[PDB]
Amino acid sequence: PITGLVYDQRMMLHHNMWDSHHPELPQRISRIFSRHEELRLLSRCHRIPARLATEEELALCHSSKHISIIKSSEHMKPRDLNRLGDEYNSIFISNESYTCALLAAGSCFNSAQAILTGQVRNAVAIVRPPGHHAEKDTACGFCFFNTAALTARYAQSITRESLRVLIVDWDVHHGNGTQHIFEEDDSVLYISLHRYEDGAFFPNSEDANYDKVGLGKGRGYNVNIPWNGGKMGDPEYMAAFHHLVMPIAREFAPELVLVSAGFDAARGDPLGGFQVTPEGYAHLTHQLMSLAAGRVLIILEGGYNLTSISESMSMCTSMLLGDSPPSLDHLTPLKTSATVSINNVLRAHAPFWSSLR
Ligand SMILES: CCNNC(=O)c1ccc(CN(CC(=O)NCc2ccccc2)C(=O)c2ccc(N(C)C)cc2)cc1
Ligand SMILES: [K+]
Ligand SMILES: [K+]
Numbered sequence: 001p002i003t004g005l006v007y008d009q010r011m012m013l014h015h016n017m018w019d020s021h022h023p024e025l026p027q028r029i030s031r032i033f034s035r036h037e038e039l040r041l042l043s044r045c046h047r048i049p050a051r052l053a054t055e056e057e058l059a060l061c062h063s064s065k066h067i068s069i070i071k072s073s074e075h076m077k078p079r080d081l082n083r084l085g086d087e088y089n090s091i092f093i094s095n096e097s098y099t100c101a102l103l104a105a106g107s108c109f110n111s112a113q114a115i116l117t118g119q120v121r122n123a124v125a126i127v128r129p130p131g132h133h134a135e136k137d138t139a140c141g142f143c144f145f146n147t148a149a150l151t152a153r154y155a156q157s158i159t160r161e162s163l164r165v166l167i168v169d170w171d172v173h174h175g176n177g178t179q180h181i182f183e184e185d186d187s188v189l190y191i192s193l194h195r196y197e198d199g200a201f202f203p204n205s206e207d208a209n210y211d212k213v214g215l216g217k218g219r220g221y222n223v224n225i226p227w228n229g230g231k232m233g234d235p236e237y238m239a240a241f242h243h244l245v246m247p248i249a250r251e252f253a254p255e256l257v258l259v260s261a262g263f264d265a266a267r268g269d270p271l272g273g274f275q276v277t278p279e280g281y282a283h284l285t286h287q288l289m290s291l292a293a294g295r296v297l298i299i300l301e302g303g304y305n306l307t308s309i310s311e312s313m314s315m316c317t318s319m320l321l322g323d324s325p326p327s328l329d330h331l332t333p334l335k336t337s338a339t340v341s342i343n344n345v346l347r348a349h350a351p352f353w354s355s356l357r
């Protein structure tokens with residue numbers, strides 16, 4: 001059992017040239033990486049190299065027009081970059097953004113390949129810019145290409161089209177792009193937990209509600225767990241895993257687990273408003289390790305408190321390495337609205353999953 005780790009400091013080149021304090025900071029990845037060193041976790045991992053995704057690989061999920069537009073930003077001057085970025089929802093672009101997005105995706109491709117060929121058992125990808133808001137045809141919410149979605153399709157391309165991939169998205173925001181890319185697909189199970197607030201929280205769409213269960217053959221393969229009216233934390237995430245994520249995931253029996261591992265639900269995050277602890281994230285990671293014979297790839301998404309994300313992601317790597325999970329209290333009562341959310345998801349998905357009946 002070997003754990004892979006991918007990190008390339010070049011991904012720090014993507015930056016906001018008009019707001020040096022924008023929360024999607026270059027040092028998000030360097031702080032996580034340096035915490036892995038300080039905790040003596042890096043030397044326990046097999047270092048997997050970063051690489052650029054190719055344009056053909058980007059076409060696994062993205063349109064040619066979208067690829068060409070982001071590609072063209074490499075040669076743009078500042079005011080043209082500002083105009084292009086301003087055309088999207090919550091995007092900044094520099095002339096290194098395209099390359100950094102390619103490196104984020106290619107790093108995850110190399111990690112998925114190492115897992116699926118048995119070079120490592122599991123892996124962590126300390127990458128930016130993030131991916132889960134990116135749609136087939138557009139950038140959004142700090143994301144250019146949908147790294148997690150691309151990695152699922154890349155994994156299928158190097159094994160079988162039918163390779164069962166579970167994507168668990170625990171970033172505090174809904175991964176609208178991931179949901180849409182796989183909405184009609186039963187080979188990729190998408191499960192998102194996210195702050196919803198009746199559609200008021202970013203990305204501000206009722207697509208994130210519990211009644212969006214998938215389309216066509218994909219009915220049942222899109223599981224939205226939306227939180228309303230409460231600062232959710234370890235008890236609520238553990239309960240969602242116990243009642244929903246794990247029963248559904250075990251019935252699906254994935255062959256690869258990708259975690260869209262944002263750490264913006266973490267205690268201390270400046271915008272998530274939630275309070276998942278590093279130990280909570282460890283618990284969730286250890287649960288997912290019981291799936292897919294342990295073939296788990298943890299991919300950084302959001303998370304903006306540099307200390308919180310560094311401690312939280314490092315705790316996840318400690319779990320992948322086989323360290324014992326922290327003991328948590330499974331009998332702490334849930335905040336009332338969390339019980340309402342979980343029950344709503346159970347009612348929506350019971351028709352599709354015998355484990356819920
Ligand atoms: C990729 C991983 N998962 N996705 C995220 O993590 C994520 C994606 C997008 C955003 C952008 N949004 C969300 C929003 O609702 N925007 C509308 C808005 C907010 C407040 C008043 C008027 C309108 C901010 O709120 C924001 C933007 C800038 C900012 N700075 C420069 C300090 C702070 C917060 C935040 C997080
Ligand atoms: K999510
Ligand atoms: K799906």
Ligand SMILES: [Zn+2]
Pocket residue numbers: 171172173262264301302303
């Ligand atoms: Zn987020």
